[PDB]
């Protein structure tokens, strides 16, 4: 599995609506290309992918 270190998060835009009204970007550095499983550990926000 890939290795992720020094992961920082920021939000580009947000608008609380019924639709998926929000975009966030994650920056990181790895050692090889691959596929990861992403998740939100709370109930305030629900992801899409």
């Amino acid at each position: 599995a890939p290795t992720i270190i020094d992961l920082t998060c920021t939000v580009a835009t947000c608008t609380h609506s019924s639709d998926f009204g929000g975009v966030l970007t994650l920056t990181y550095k790895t050692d090889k290309n691959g596929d990861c499983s992403v998740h939100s550990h709370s109930n305030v926000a629900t992801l899409q992918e």
Binding site: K32, N33, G34, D35
Partner: protein
């Protein structure tokens, strides 16, 4: 690279998992995976 990894041509040293070939996206440097599919 790994057994489950294929390279984007001999001229490029990057290697990507085989599940990314012909996936509808240009995962390689210049869409080499989607070539001839």
């Amino acid at each position: 690279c790994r057994i489950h990894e294929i390279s984007c041509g001999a001229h490029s040293t990057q290697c990507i998992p085989v599940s990314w070939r012909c996936d509808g996206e240009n995962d390689c440097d210049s869409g080499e995976d989607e070539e001839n599919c």
